[PDB]
Design an enzyme around this catalytic site. Structure first.
Site, PDB file in Angstrom:
ATOM      1  N   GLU A  61       0.798  -1.215   0.000  1.00  0.00           N
ATOM      2  CA  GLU A  61       0.000   0.000   0.000  1.00  0.00           C
ATOM      3  C   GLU A  61       0.831   1.265   0.000  1.00  0.00           C
ATOM      4  O   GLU A  61       0.410   2.277  -0.598  1.00  0.00           O
ATOM      5  CB  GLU A  61      -1.011   0.016   1.176  1.00  0.00           C
ATOM      6  CG  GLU A  61      -2.214  -0.982   1.006  1.00  0.00           C
ATOM      7  CD  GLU A  61      -1.840  -2.462   1.219  1.00  0.00           C
ATOM      8  OE1 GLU A  61      -0.745  -2.763   1.784  1.00  0.00           O
ATOM      9  OE2 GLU A  61      -2.639  -3.343   0.790  1.00  0.00           O
ATOM     10  N   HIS A  88     -11.838  -5.393   8.524  1.00  0.00           N
ATOM     11  CA  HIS A  88     -12.697  -5.308   7.349  1.00  0.00           C
ATOM     12  C   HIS A  88     -13.833  -4.276   7.563  1.00  0.00           C
ATOM     13  O   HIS A  88     -14.745  -4.168   6.716  1.00  0.00           O
ATOM     14  CB  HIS A  88     -13.309  -6.677   7.005  1.00  0.00           C
ATOM     15  CG  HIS A  88     -12.423  -7.551   6.153  1.00  0.00           C
ATOM     16  ND1 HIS A  88     -12.895  -8.675   5.518  1.00  0.00           N
ATOM     17  CD2 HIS A  88     -11.107  -7.469   5.844  1.00  0.00           C
ATOM     18  CE1 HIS A  88     -11.914  -9.252   4.851  1.00  0.00           C
ATOM     19  NE2 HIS A  88     -10.812  -8.551   5.036  1.00  0.00           N
TER      20      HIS A  88
HETATM   21  C1  LIG Z   1      -2.109  -4.802   4.100  1.00  0.00           C
HETATM   22  C2  LIG Z   1      -3.172  -5.720   3.419  1.00  0.00           C
HETATM   23  N1  LIG Z   1      -3.549  -5.533   2.160  1.00  0.00           N
HETATM   24  C3  LIG Z   1      -4.428  -6.327   1.498  1.00  0.00           C
HETATM   25  C4  LIG Z   1      -5.030  -7.412   2.166  1.00  0.00           C
HETATM   26  C5  LIG Z   1      -6.062  -8.220   1.376  1.00  0.00           C
HETATM   27  N2  LIG Z   1      -5.522  -9.579   1.107  1.00  0.00           N
HETATM   28  C6  LIG Z   1      -5.973 -10.600   2.033  1.00  0.00           C
HETATM   29  S1  LIG Z   1      -5.121 -12.086   1.390  1.00  0.00           S
HETATM   30  C7  LIG Z   1      -4.340 -11.273   0.029  1.00  0.00           C
HETATM   31  C8  LIG Z   1      -3.469 -12.038  -0.923  1.00  0.00           C
HETATM   32  C9  LIG Z   1      -2.306 -12.562  -0.052  1.00  0.00           C
HETATM   33  O1  LIG Z   1      -1.401 -13.283  -0.951  1.00  0.00           O
HETATM   34  P1  LIG Z   1      -0.184 -14.174  -0.426  1.00  0.00           P
HETATM   35  O2  LIG Z   1       0.574 -13.368   0.580  1.00  0.00           O
HETATM   36  O3  LIG Z   1       0.525 -14.618  -1.695  1.00  0.00           O
HETATM   37  O4  LIG Z   1      -0.891 -15.423   0.335  1.00  0.00           O
HETATM   38  P2  LIG Z   1      -1.821 -16.594  -0.262  1.00  0.00           P
HETATM   39  O5  LIG Z   1      -3.304 -16.052  -0.146  1.00  0.00           O
HETATM   40  O6  LIG Z   1      -1.438 -16.848  -1.700  1.00  0.00           O
HETATM   41  O7  LIG Z   1      -1.609 -17.807   0.596  1.00  0.00           O
HETATM   42  C10 LIG Z   1      -4.733  -9.906   0.037  1.00  0.00           C
HETATM   43  C11 LIG Z   1      -4.289  -8.835  -0.979  1.00  0.00           C
HETATM   44  C12 LIG Z   1      -4.661  -7.631   3.538  1.00  0.00           C
HETATM   45  N3  LIG Z   1      -5.199  -8.590   4.282  1.00  0.00           N
HETATM   46  N4  LIG Z   1      -3.673  -6.787   4.136  1.00  0.00           N
HETATM   47 CL   LIG Z   2      -8.042  -9.833   4.403  1.00  0.00          CL
END
Ligand SMILES: Cc1ncc(C[n+]2csc(CCOP(=O)(O)OP(=O)(O)O)c2C)c(N)n1
Ligand SMILES: [Cl-]
Ligand SMILES: Cc1ncc(C[n+]2csc(CCOP(=O)(O)OP(=O)(O)O)c2C)c(N)n1
Ligand SMILES: [Cl-]
Ligand SMILES: [K+]
Ligand SMILES: [K+]
Ligand SMILES: [K+]
Ligand SMILES: [K+]
Ligand SMILES: [Mn+2]
Ligand SMILES: [Mn+2]
Lengths: 369, 329, 369, 329
Positions: free
Chosen positions: B63, B133
């Site tokens: 972000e 959320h």
């Molecule tokens: C700071 C922040 N930004 C966005 C999110 C929304 N978000 C929840 S899971 C995710 C994808 C996470 O990807 P990864 O770290 O590759 O883990 P995976 O889901 O593939 O196991 C996002 C963008 C969040 N929880 N925290």
């Molecule tokens: Cl999330």
């Protein structure tokens, strides 16, 4: 050259350093897709009881996933994150840790708790936010935590746990009691600023920490081509001075071996290690199953009976969890600070007065009183 | 009034605003996490296919990078419409917003600016969002001169306010109440139109008390007005603030000089919440007209809970009870 | 292997990847300490007029530094950051850019402005916050900016300019007019989260940007041993997929060559380049001076006359700057937003009323009216 | 009262607090940018030589890392005293403070906490600090349940409040007014002592008006009290708030019930500033006692300027003029 910033020779020709992404860091594997050991000198030869525990932890996790995923589809719980494809990275790495090593993670780490014998009742209590939940129903489902099993409570903001895990590792070093910290995160989370913070601090402050990155090629809808352009996350470790390895996340033995060696050296040397485990968004359960069969350690009858028993245990916990009341609504006010400020107590009293008069309009039916 | 309309819910109204923007401004780009496939709340569906991958694109999951990147696009004069996936995750970017975006024009003597930046983000409670959320961060931003903070109450209002943000020559944060994304549709003009920033809207005239809110909470206070009329014979003036900063002081003060009572409500926690700024200002400007203390009916001073949400929110009964007491002061 | 996250082979033996810090990325040099060209195929053979301009820009900067540093010691200006040791990295890289390439930086980049013919009067006006300052006296000294010379106004928070520079580079790509962006920062600033943001975004979004890191071994009191443990900043570039080089920051020709080639390829290929220039906290001015003498392009008489003339020009600008009034105090209220909100105008009127009554208590003497 | 004292300025009083802390708490560590050699404001001089390099140490230049690291130390129960070099640079850490540190205990049901964290940072104007060496960020943090925010007015107060922060079982931000670091010394006890958090101090009793401030601004309002007494025959009750959150509502309300008038002053910008929370609360609790509108005399709603500082700050003449008008309302 005489520059304090770097140790290097001169060069008299202009040459940019090119990344090697096409042939990246190779992926360590111990057993093939048919569950066969590829290189006998790398076989950890774990005893039958422990290998069965790896298998039963993975499958039990998978059974729980199926049921809670359906529960979420029906709106019985508000949210769920499964562990599909991540059972081997978590069970295999957990098995290589000492029971008191501190774990930080996020959404894919339930298998660590399962390996550590976290009760099915407590996984459910957190998802349902019921009176048995030690988190007092305050966080969204799958935001697990266990002080007794040294698993620090999950939080939704990605990567925040990474520099925290480094701080806990520094404190462990000072305390001198032969403990590691492990910190799990996805390849998406590794793009956060906090990942650069934690990797760098762990190296400069010489911290006994394992960074465990799960790379399954996607962060929600985003493929890794849009997430980074170097050779995954493992290739970042050396630039921070961190010893680094990439492993086959479908191979519980490769994960186990790499985590066991990282843990040994992190604690002895007070230096960080980075393991990048490659997974899919050819499954760890199937592969270990093939291995068990070759050893004569499992068969179809055992598989059937365990499938039956694990379904029964999860359904027993599920039904009990749905039937428990939620915590007293007063609990929304405690633990904001250790004590309750007078002004916060005033707000708690204001809610008690409100419910006295307008209570019929609230679902008090369901909450402890 | 505004040409042909069609029924749209709030997410569709956002897409309509973004589409109109890209159509009429060749510089404009939209970016953030998972925007390419249409976004986690479907606000950017169709836009990449329509306008091109160089114009609607995913960033890495970072972000502080999203906002820093957006500021840089805006520094060249191009329109930058950044998305932050939940308002709860805007905090990593707080330094880029507060220290950089808000101060960019001032600190350069207007040699450089990032006026063509807008950051849009889902906001407010959603029934089960819990701590990360659900948040309503507008008060944190209200204390930062140089940014504008705007929050709509409906699809018609969202498209008009968002188009104004995108076109406004100052960095804007536009918070979209996510619980309204797929709530009821209303008619929304297909062609672009603007609703002015820093202008409150009196949506119902009244004579006994002024009620002020924004976002979803406007619907709550509308209902409270109805309850007060039916149960108490009390006539409420209902006002949607719309822009948090710079806020429409005059419209609120004019209403309170008429009614002599004010109740402000918001989902955000009481302490340091934006209701405190409105209350203190109205008290200064309307002191001799106040029949009763200005009341603030807000979230409690806690993190936003999962299972306890129904007990946490400043709902219509909480607002009604406060109003009853104020009418009786 | 079949993992979308990385392109790699399997390996059947456990092997951690070790950083190579002891023999790091070598340091590119064109001329030795005696100003001699080491490798003729690398000599850029810049013409005499341009090389004299590199030399006079560096020395003029150094003359200005001496005077303003003394001014700061006396409290005549509130703050100052010198350019000592950084004259060659800035003048040499600026010379390799096109005049309209956009520059982001921070505190060590005045030589870029000097090379771009920024008037001495305007450097001074900013330090004194006087009526000639286009920044209207709002920022601390040395927070320079010039829209006409494409040098984006400096801000005190370290590394914030890095992801912004990437955004400006993306916008330039779209605009399709053969422009690069260059972004300067120190090795300390590279530890910030925003550095990880900018490096990664520039690679994944394919941006025509040069990242120019000055590594002088220290960030205030902190030696690089406490700042990072990999092979400086250059070794980080490849992990992001960024083409990377390290250069001798005391060698204007090595800096020039590396920046010229990075600029050519960044604009043609739409990809980021990282240059890490090693400096001291054996000086770039001395080295270039030795070079000029070998060519017969300078001598002691010219050196004396230029030292005299440059001192005169800086002192003329200095004296004029001290004598100008400060801007009207009303200017404290404009440019907060493009327009002035009614409520802000109210505050401006409140100050005007206040000064009407209590003005004797304010230093109105000095401010434009 | 507190044993042997010696003259100390505010930086020396901070060192004394830190030294006492390290002496009595073997877990305690101090870290941040440039702390090892004694710090840019000399607050940690001597401590590394005295307590060891593993206990007083430099981090990389990364504020979000400093705070995340501190939280992690505190999660194990060890005392973590983080430094942020200027309060202006606390923003990169805003997400770690607001989303993580403040919510740590709540969101875990008290299974985990970071109570043993304290973040100390230089704060407030300094004559020529301009936009990024001058800021007073306390209002941004005031809207975040779960952290405490504390600001002393003198060396004696700094050491007592800082020791309380370090020992308090909640994450604390302690803002040190940097313009006071080398200002006048006063006697400060050599041995540890505590001053309670969430407790205002009435430093001068008065009957006509209550004046509230914190940090350096307390000295300004002391002087304003003197001017009002001499020039207007007006008796002012002067109060140092000390803790921003949780704040001492009772001490302020009790004073206003007596005086019937309140003036609050702070260097931070007016809009969304903490004066708005105090004003709104006092108005609610003291409504029938208010003789005049509560007045807020604050920084303007702009970034903090370099050359214009003398015109920007809510100085004693600005405060005095507001007070004169209020007494005459
Ligand atoms: C700071 C922040 N930004 C966005 C999110 C929304 N978000 C929840 S899971 C995710 C994808 C996470 O990807 P990864 O770290 O590759 O883990 P995976 O889901 O593939 O196991 C996002 C963008 C969040 N929880 N925290
Ligand atoms: Cl999330
Ligand atoms: C976010 C932030 N933190 C801290 C500072 C204080 N600070 C000003 S310069 C500096 C050292 C910068 O080091 P480096 O980036 O190596 O540049 P150099 O001074 O060596 O040229 C620090 C910590 C700042 N300006 N911004
Ligand atoms: Cl600085
Ligand atoms: K987290
Ligand atoms: K805008
Ligand atoms: K900067
Ligand atoms: K504490
Ligand atoms: Mn992933
Ligand atoms: Mn440096």
């Amino acid at each position: 050259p005489q520059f304090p910033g770097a140790s290097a020779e001169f060069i008299d020709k202009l040459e940019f350093i090119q990344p090697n992404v096409i042939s990246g860091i190779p992926i360590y594997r111990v057993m093939d897709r048919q569950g066969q050991i590829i290189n006998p000198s790398e076989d950890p030869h774990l005893p039958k009881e422990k290998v069965l525990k790896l298998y039963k932890s993975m499958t039990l996790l998978n059974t729980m996933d199926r049921i809670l995923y359906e529960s979420q589809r029906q709106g019985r719980i508000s949210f769920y994150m499964t562990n599909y494809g991540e059972e081997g990275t978590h069970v295999g790495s957990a098995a290589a840790l000492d029971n008191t090593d501190l774990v930080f993670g996020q959404y894919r780490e339930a298998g660590v708790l399962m390996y550590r014998d976290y009760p099915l009742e407590l996984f459910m209590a957190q998802c349902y936010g019921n009176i048995s939940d030690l988190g007092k129903g305050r966080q969204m489902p799958v935001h697990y935590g266990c002080k007794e099993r040294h698993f620090v409570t999950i939080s939704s903001p990605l990567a925040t746990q990474i520099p925290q895990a480094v701080g806990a590792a520094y404190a462990a070093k000072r305390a001198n009691a032969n403990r590691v910290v492990i910190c799990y995160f996805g390849e998406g989370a590794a793009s956060e600023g906090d990942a650069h913070a934690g990797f760098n601090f762990a190296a400069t402050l010489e911290c006994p920490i394992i960074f465990f990155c799960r790379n399954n090629g996607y962060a929600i809808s985003t493929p890794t081509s849009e997430q980074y352009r170097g050779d995954g996350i493992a290739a970042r470790g050396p630039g921070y001075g961190i010893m680094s390895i990439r492993v086959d996340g479908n191979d519980v033995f490769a994960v186990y071996n790499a985590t066991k060696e990282a843990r040994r050296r992190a604690v002895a040397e007070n230096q960080p290690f980075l393991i990048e485990a490659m997974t899919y968004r050819d499954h760890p359960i199937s592969r270990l199953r093939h291995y068990l069969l070759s050893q004569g350690w499992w068969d179809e009858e055992q598989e059937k009976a365990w499938r039956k028993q694990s379904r029964r245990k999860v359904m027993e916990a599920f039904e009990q969890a749905e039937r428990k009341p939620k915590p007293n609504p007063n609990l929304l006010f405690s633990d904001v600070y250790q004590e309750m400020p007078a002004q916060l107590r005033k707000q708690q009293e204001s809610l008690a007065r409100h419910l006295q008069t307008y209570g019929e309009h609230y679902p008090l039916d369901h909450f402890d009183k | 009034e505004y040409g042909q309309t069609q029924k749209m819910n709030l997410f569709q109204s956002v897409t309509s605003a973004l589409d109109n923007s890209l159509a009429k401004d060749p510089t404009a780009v939209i970016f953030g996490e998972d925007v390419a496939f249409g976004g986690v709340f479907r606000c950017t569906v169709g836009l990449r296919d329509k306008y091109g991958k160089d114009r609607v694109f995913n960033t890495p999951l970072c972000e502080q990078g999203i906002v820093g990147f957006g500021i840089g696009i805006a520094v060249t004069g191009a329109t930058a419409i950044a998305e932050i996936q939940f308002a709860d995750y805007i905090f990593p970017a707080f330094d880029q917003i507060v220290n950089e975006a808000a101060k960019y024009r001032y600190r350069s003597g207007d040699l450089f600016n990032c006026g063509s930046l807008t950051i849009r983000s889902p906001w407010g409670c959603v029934g089960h969002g819990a701590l990360y959320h659900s948040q309503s961060p507008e008060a944190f931003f209200a204390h930062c001169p140089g940014i504008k903070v705007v929050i709509p109450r409906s699809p018609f209002q969202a498209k008009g306010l968002l188009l104004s943000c995108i076109e406004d020559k100052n960095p804007c944060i536009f918070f979209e109440p996510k619980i309204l994304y797929r709530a009821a549709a209303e008619e929304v003009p297909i062609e672009p139109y603007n609703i002015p920033l820093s202008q409150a809207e009196v949506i119902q005239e009244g004579s006994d008390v002024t009620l002020v809110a924004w976002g979803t909470q406007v619907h709550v206070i509308r209902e409270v007005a109805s309850m007060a009329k039916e149960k108490l014979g009390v006539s409420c003036e209902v006002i949607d603030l719309r822009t948090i900063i710079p806020w429409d002081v005059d419209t609120i003060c004019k209403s309170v000089i008429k009614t002599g009572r004010l109740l402000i409500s918001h989902e955000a926690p009481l302490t340091g919440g934006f209701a405190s700024e409105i209350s203190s200002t109205v008290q200064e400007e309307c002191f001799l007209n106040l029949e009763a203390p200005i009341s603030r009916v807000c979230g409690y001073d806690t993190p936003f809970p999962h299972i306890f949400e129904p007990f946490y929110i400043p709902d219509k009964w909480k607002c009604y009870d406060a109003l009853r007491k104020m009418i009786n002061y």
